[PDB]
Amino acid sequence: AVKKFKPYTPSRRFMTVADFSEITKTEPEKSLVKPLKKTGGRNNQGRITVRFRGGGHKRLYRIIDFKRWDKVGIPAKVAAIEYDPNRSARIALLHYVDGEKRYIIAPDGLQVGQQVVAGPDAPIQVGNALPLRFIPVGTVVHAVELEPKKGAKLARAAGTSAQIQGREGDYVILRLPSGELRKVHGECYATVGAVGNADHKNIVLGKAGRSRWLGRRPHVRGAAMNPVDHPHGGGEGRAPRGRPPASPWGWQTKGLKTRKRRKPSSRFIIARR
Template identity: 45%
Template sequence: MAAASLSQLVKGLARLSILNHAKSRQYFHTSGIVDGKAKFIKLAINVDRYTLRPIHLPKSGGRGYDGRIQTHGVGGGHRQCYRMVDFKRIGPKTGEPLVERVLDVRYDPCRSADIAVVAGGEKARYIVASENMKSGDLIKSSGELKKITVKAIEGDSYPLGSLPLGTLVHNIEIYPETGGRVARAAGTCGQLIKKIGDRCIIRMPSKREMNVSEECRATVGRVSNIDHNKQHIGSASRARWFGIRPDRGWKQKKSGYNGRKIKPVKPVVIHRTPKAPASAIYKDTV
């Protein structure tokens, strides 16, 4: 009898595992400190299963998974739903490009730019809409790096090495086939100004330049909603509707005399190899 109970105890201990509380709570968005039964709940968005359905987005209140403030001035606001925007405009590397039709251009409360619903074959997805994109347009996505430059049409996606100099681009990759990371906000774009070997130089609106591979893809044109920076909120109550909390009021608005001084342009940013992935081993720190 004692031997049987001892064997059951050993089997039970074998099933035990160390639970990393930070790992189990990193996707739990909350406006307060996570405690009690709620700290083991996972409310992560399954990114492996794509859907056009708007997904409920819990408010974070500017707090991280540990309940501490990470972004000040954020809280409240109207309820929002997350749309899974696909930033990877990856097309075939050989043959004809992928052709998709724009079904609709919609407003997205989670970003400053508009998004477009595009479909090709049996698949539909959200992408960042360009400035003049409208329903019924046909857009192309190609991954073929051509020696002769292609005709740059707004909304099409090509490797930077296939585009002519002077082209305005957005949704720019910094590493090949990793998805657009730069120039995704409303009205933003970069300009392809130079090609050096297998590298391309892009000038951003801040006059700073970045050096990326010619295989990095980008979408031709400027991001939609170009008048976003001219939007006037108008009242404090409308600011709270957008989830913007009031300032402390101690710092007054500066006159034209005060402000930032003219500084030299920063050096070129060179993106060659992506960073190594984070280690799966978790260490306890004091």
């Protein structure tokens, strides 16, 4: 869990690569990949709408199953645990008995050979997925639906999870990985346990190039621009912001809240980040 390196170069000093022990299969499931279009952060008009992107490895997209409920009651055996370049986590390849192959995003604690199933039935065990209403309160759970049948949305990122705090009416009270407190509808599926590859946050990029491999290009500071360019540009040697700090588009960037206030989902929230 987290490879380190001798310092036989600079930057090989602080580098850290993930441990790949959990990985069973070294090439993906041909059935389950589509190629994906790399945007470079350019939207349909050829305009950059997210800065500092592009470069980075050719990448095959793995189509992963975010609705477990098409297969209700059909068991499946976990066939392998794989590397997915498109996400923080690991994907499990698993074979349904009725012969369909799907990718689940791998819970921690899941191992190859395990027997897994989703439905309002089903044991409470790692990898099984149920309607939220049927998980015992106090469970920790991942890959959670936010509206019934709409796809899993919350807690898909390596090492994240969420927790059932209580039930009220048609809805259950979820603690999100943000610490926000949310009612989610009881009918929403979720699959028990946390996401794993939790050691993920401790990997140390370690050198400039290695940030490029991830397709994120250099990020140049406001301060280091001119005034045509940023609210912080201009000013001889350095200078401080000399105004409350701002985005290139000139809104305030320290503490100013951007959530819409009159948003209808406010009726469903109790907490923050």
